[PDB]
Design a protein around this ligand. Structure first.
Ligand SMILES: Oc1ccc([C@@H](O)CNCc2ccc3ccccc3c2)cc1O
Ligand SMILES: [Zn+2]
Ligand SMILES: [Zn+2]
Lengths: 154, 155
């Protein structure tokens, strides 16, 4: 069983980075950390999307990974997609030093994210609190700036 | 036992690029592998699944051929082969390999699952273990990694 995974994020613009995933126990939380650069200062939606398909760029990754067919939420919510990792924050130099721990994604089993796509978005994820239909689907986080397939790591 | 389709976008430092599809209708049946890879020199090119889906150093960080049974390198029809030994693909005079392979050793689920690992197309022919040196029973002498991608779950 995989205990480590990695994702190289690339897109059409300047946004790029490397995100690592580590999971001590298949029961336990996944630590997610790494650095993304080229971003506008502030919050960006950060999600695992369902398909590891980059054939038409980030668009072919499909919607948020949601095998329990829930509504969109933030990572602390009981009602959330498996792929709802919330936001990451870029500093004034355009750098997000990502550091998240999450107990809903996994590197094995039904919630396994290996082979799916990590995407960093154009705008803040509103965490399902925007009071419109789109908030309960995508969090209003806008365009996909960069993405990559999550792969098994050594 | 749940993924029935996968996809891989191959890219590299040169002109080689392609899209490869994988389909496995039954979890205990074969995987069909097909697609098109352009920018290749005419002739045979090694075509392998490497162990790690790690592209942080481009194709180099993918590590060696995926080989969970710790066998020696072979061709896909050999009993003695790596799980990742898919043989060669052939590029035509226009630089295009129209890949079409069916393999019963790789899978899209369980322990031979290649989801999340890296598909690489190589510079030269894979000699299928028959080259009479130790590099032959490790990599098939297929030489450098021209393009690669992580194999992802597809719709
Ligand atoms: O939930 C978990 C929390 C922690 C772990 C540890 O094994 C992994 N520790 C992470 C780590 C390791 C090295 C780092 C270097 C620079 C910046 C951040 C870094 C985070 C597993 C988990 O599954
Ligand atoms: Zn969501
Ligand atoms: Zn091999």
């Amino acid at each position: 069983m995989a205990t480590k995974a990695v994702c190289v994020l690339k897109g059409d613009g300047p946004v790029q980075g490397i995100i690592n995933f580590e999971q001590k126990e298949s029961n336990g939380p996944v630590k997610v950390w790494g650095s993304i650069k080229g971003l506008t200062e502030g919050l960006h939606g950060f999600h695992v999307h369902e398909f590891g398909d980059n054939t038409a760029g980030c668009t072919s990754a499909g919607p948020h990974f949601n095998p329990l067919s829930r509504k969109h939420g933030g990572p602390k919510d009981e009602e959330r997609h498996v792929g709802d990792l919330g936001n990451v924050t870029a500093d004034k130099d355009g750098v997000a030093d990502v550091s998240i721990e999450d107990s809903v994604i996994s590197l094995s089993g039904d919630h396994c994210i290996i082979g799916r796509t990590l995407v960093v978005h154009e705008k803040a994820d509103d965490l399902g609190k925007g009071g419109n239909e789109e908030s309960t689907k995508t969090g209003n986080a806008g365009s996909r700036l960069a993405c990559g397939v999550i792969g098994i790591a050594q």
